[PDB]
Amino acid sequence: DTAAAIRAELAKMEPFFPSGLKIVYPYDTTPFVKISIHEVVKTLVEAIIL
Amino acid sequence: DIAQVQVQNKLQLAMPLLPQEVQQQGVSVEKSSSSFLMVVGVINTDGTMT
Amino acid sequence: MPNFFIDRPIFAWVIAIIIMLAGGLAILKLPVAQYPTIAPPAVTISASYPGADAKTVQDTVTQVIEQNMNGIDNLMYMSSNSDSTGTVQITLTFESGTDADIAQVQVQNKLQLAMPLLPQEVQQQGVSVEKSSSSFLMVVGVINTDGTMTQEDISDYVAANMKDAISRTSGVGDVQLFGSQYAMRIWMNPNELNKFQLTPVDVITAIKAQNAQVAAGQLGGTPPVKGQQLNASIIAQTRLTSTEEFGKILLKVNQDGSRVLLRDVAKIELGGENYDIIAEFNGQPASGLGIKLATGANALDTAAAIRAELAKMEPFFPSGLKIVYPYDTTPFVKISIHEVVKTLVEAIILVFLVMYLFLQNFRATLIPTIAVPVVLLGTFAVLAAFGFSINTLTMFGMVLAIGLLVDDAIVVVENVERVMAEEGLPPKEATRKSMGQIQGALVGIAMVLSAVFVPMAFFGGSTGAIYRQFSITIVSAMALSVLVALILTPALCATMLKPIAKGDHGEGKKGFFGWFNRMFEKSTHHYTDSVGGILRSTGRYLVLYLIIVVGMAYLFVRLPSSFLPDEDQGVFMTMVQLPAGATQERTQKVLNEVTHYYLTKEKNNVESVFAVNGFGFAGRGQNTGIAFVSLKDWADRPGEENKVEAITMRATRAFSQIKDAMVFAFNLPAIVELGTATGFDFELIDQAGLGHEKLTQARNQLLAEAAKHPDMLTSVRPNGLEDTPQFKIDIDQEKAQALGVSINDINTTLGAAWGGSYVNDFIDRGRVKKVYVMSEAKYRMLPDDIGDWYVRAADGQMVPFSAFSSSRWEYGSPRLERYNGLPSMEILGQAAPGKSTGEAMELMEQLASKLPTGVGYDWTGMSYQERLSGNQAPSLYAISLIVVFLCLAALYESWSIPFSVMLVVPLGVIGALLAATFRGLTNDVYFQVGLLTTIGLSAKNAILIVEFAKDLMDKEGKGLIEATLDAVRMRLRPILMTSLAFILGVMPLVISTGAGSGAQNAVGTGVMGGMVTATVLAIFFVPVFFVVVRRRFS
Amino acid sequence: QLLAEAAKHPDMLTSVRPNGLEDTPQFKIDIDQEKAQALGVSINDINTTLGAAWGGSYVNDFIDRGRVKKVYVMSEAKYRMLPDDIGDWYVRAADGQMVPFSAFSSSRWEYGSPRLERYNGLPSMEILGQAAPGKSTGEAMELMEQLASKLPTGVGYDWTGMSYQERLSGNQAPSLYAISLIVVFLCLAALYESWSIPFS
């Protein structure tokens, strides 16, 4: 939730950046969390099918 | 919340005794993790900013 | 369970007694208020920088404090104002449900770490963090009728004598003094200072040296000498106590030996810490206390206790001192609560009367008269359990749920009586049979009504807080009503009802009740005949149902929306705004004109006026004023012309003739904790460091664009102040150095003389009070007066300001705003008639999207909450519809029969809409909750009809048409008596025109219309729906 | 007056004492600032001298075995005991003269409370006492409030600490009994489906 709020705030800020300024995310473990939980849910669905 | 409140209640007794230079820089009391939730970097792809 | 308590009447009575005792305890111990906490929790940081302009305050205080408001949880947004009066106010608004105490302590703690970074004068004046609020429980004014006391005298008396005991009174949460205690005032004479070669710096140094507390030590202290026997504390210089001591302060000694004292160069007196606000009551000087209710406290009890304390205080008052109550809405709260209580009592009495009319049995009429009060008491107990108070919303929720309560009682008792009169069974067996007919339907109805009403308790924001009161009240009342109908009512029916013969229906009775019985029998026969005729030709009426649904949608999409009706609470407000640069005296002239108009032209209506010169709302200053007008009792103000709306319209028309002053009189909102309407709050944000002038240009561009849309936006205005002329002094420090004059001396002289300086504290009659040095008014009025001030140089010669300074006129902001830490401009507007607030906000966003680069925008206030909570209520009411369908399917053990019940929803709604359209009411909260209760009652009736028809079809061999006809015949009477009782009970609310009539009419009109249409249409549409559904799916 | 009245009841009250301190003599010092200025001695110097000598002054911190501790400057005891001991204390003037305190100061004796107590915001005095042997705290409380009722107007009383709790318990006992009896009656009536069984 905090990461989502931070990203929303950065999205609010972006329209007023100087020309050329760009936001990057060199360290973010949230994608791993999302993909891992999605993989477990996929496992549950596959288990139901089997 | 209560931990931070009690810590600052104890710290405000020491605040007057601190050097004026330390007070001017601002003493901070936080309740956060020791690891970065994320790192948001900012660059200038156009190379017009140092 | 109904069968369990038919054989155990004493156990049912014990349960009822327990419920009654809990309800009585809750009633005795429950808090009472006008409204609950609706607005989101907010914290205000208030600081003052005496003598500082808006820009100085913003740059030295506001930005520093705002840059340190980090690491605070649940913060929704932050706004701030910095004024030319020297004051900065920062409002931090937090999410709903945030703990106010924890939010306040976090904010104050983050401020504590920013205090060292603030100017010393601001630190000395103190920065206060408080719970944001805009309303007082009461205002207690104090006036002098002799003219021997000024405003400062009364304020000091109130602070020293009245404030403490009132603060200690039970239920008081906060007390605000309308003024301040005395302050030692040193009014300086520049000519006398020049005569003795002195400046404000010398005066301040002398006052600080000669009015101080000095630690000395101890006689025979530790570690002591071996033989010491005596020990005594050493007392030394202490703070002064009187104006006489201050006047004797020595400033210098001359060569000729003469002594210069403070009395020689300044007038010494007792005055106010500030002079920006002048309070008058009917033209007389006034002070007072604003008193706020404590959390969980009774409003009425607290007000009565405060009045008792003031009564105990009066005997010791000085001659001419009088207590008054300029702002008292407590009478309105009392009358509103009493009106709701009377409505409940009349509803019970009318239920009794209708029961006697139809059943003509005193014992039968007694049963609901016990069942309904028991449910009401249990509802009070449940409200106390969940930490709710007795406020307007909860009592009107009880009023709306009284229909469902009486419906439950009537259903049970009438079914028992009908079984007794049809089968001739004795009361116990008849009650067993009747309960067996309706118990499952009662449980299913409980589930359906739960599904209908619970979702109101999950709306977001302040509107969610408003709806939660009705949700909890109605849900608890309905659940308790069903429980009582399954426990107590069957026991009472089996224990109290007397037997009825097999065929005795009152046909042979004489008098009115024989004619009525015969007429009702014939009417029921005709109704059943017409229902059969209708069932022969269902499709013709399906077309009529489609017409009804289309008309319902048409009426719905054309009904204006609102939040809460405006009420005549016995008070209202008048705002006076003078042109930029206007002084206190001109504002006082306008305020005197307003007071004279109210006390002469409206002497029959207006009882008193409390005029405050110095602040309005959305700003403060010498050119603003507010008059709080109190009206006489509603009993003394009969007719439409003597109510707040007409009075305020007449006052505005009369005040439109006043020149050089914008004067407007208006009524309070329903909930004054928020200023709300069908409007929007817009923030124009400087996002790229453009500055105040570019932001002003962007605001003007947006305002012009909005003005080019008269049909979509109305009254799109700035909620702020325009740039005003300012006097700029340039002190050439190089010249001051060349003349041997210190810049610190120059700044101190100028600020202390023209702005005033808080020096230190003294002790007056055992209380600490401030000491202010300021110039005499005579020498700080005009720019030329600057030529009367001198500063001593190192060489000792006294230099005038003209030697090292230049002056000019420029323009500057008297009030600077920031939003979320950036410079901001607030725009208030509203959608034009026939336009939703959402589309007005969309148009505002489209208009703002074309603003200059670096300018952003935001939504705040109620607009923020509307944007955040969007399409939520329809979503969880679709969930409610799904749950209702599932509950009905479980009840009927059918996937299709449920529809015949749900198809009843429009039949009631249409009527409500009609009643709202012809009466000219809006789609406000009361209308929506009444619509929900009408839907619930209609669903109850349809469910019972369908259950009876299905039971006849299944448990007996009866066919579809015969079963439906018998079901409607058996259900006609209870439906009719319930509808009659509820409509008669809500008659006064529709008819009411007195205090609180807005809410009463809003509640009553929709309920009346919906009940009438539902009763009329359902009794011949539910059979049609049931027959069609059963014919299609069988 | 109340203490004397309580002492008149040795068989009901014991060790009836005030929980506080009596008024003490104080040594008021007046520093003639004009006279000090005439002699060229700064008032700040006088105040610092008197305070540091007779009460002690905390200057700053030092490190003892790695721990931060305080530094105090104070007069030696023998020059700090009786009022006359300022005869040895001098303050330097702007021109280097050592002015004695007698040249710019005077003194007198006063009386003052060394400890002021307030209850619920109003001035108050705390009294402690015991019940005499063979008596209970309830009897002692009754006697104490009876004695307090006979005091000058404008003087009231209150119970605090354990006495407050004892008064609370005594006040709420009868309602507790009544509610317990009612609850038992209703429980029996529900369980046995009778009013006669609960009543008997």
Added chain:
Amino acid sequence: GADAKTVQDTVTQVIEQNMNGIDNLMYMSSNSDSTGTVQITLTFESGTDADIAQVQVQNKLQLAMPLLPQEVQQQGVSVEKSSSSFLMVVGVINTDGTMT
């Protein structure tokens, strides 16, 4: 260095004026000594959440904090949950007499 009367007028009364309006407060008792010490103990109803009570009295005390003397502010005004009874006393002595 402040007498009991002056510390009462400048500290105790200033603080206790703002100590009104706190939830579940049973009573308040203050003492002001001749060494300049002010002790204000507020006792709340049984079952009151002590942390919430402390937070509330702190929120009320912040309002009085700027009105106190600068010396009192520099010494620091402490707000804390308090007890009136010693759990235990741990004394320390020297068995040789070499330490004072």
Added chain:
Amino acid sequence: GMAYLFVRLPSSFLPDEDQGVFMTMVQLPAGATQERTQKVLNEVTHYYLT
């Protein structure tokens, strides 16, 4: 008899126990010094230890 006995029965809060410790308060007249209090305390200690 029950009503009569209830009224005449004295009330209290909690019985006093012998907890193995007790206190002695010493207060000297106004102005008494540390050493006079020490002499009185020494007398009290001598009484308790003898």
Added chain:
Amino acid sequence: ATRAFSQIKDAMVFAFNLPAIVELGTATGFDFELIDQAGLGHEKLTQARN
């Protein structure tokens, strides 16, 4: 990466992954504090640590 950076003589360079939960860290690691309990000083504490 660690093998490659072992050739940098100017600095100690270590590349590493994080544990599943940072705070638990190693499943067999211990954290130990050596306290100077008698005002020995930094030098004596360093000697004891060595």
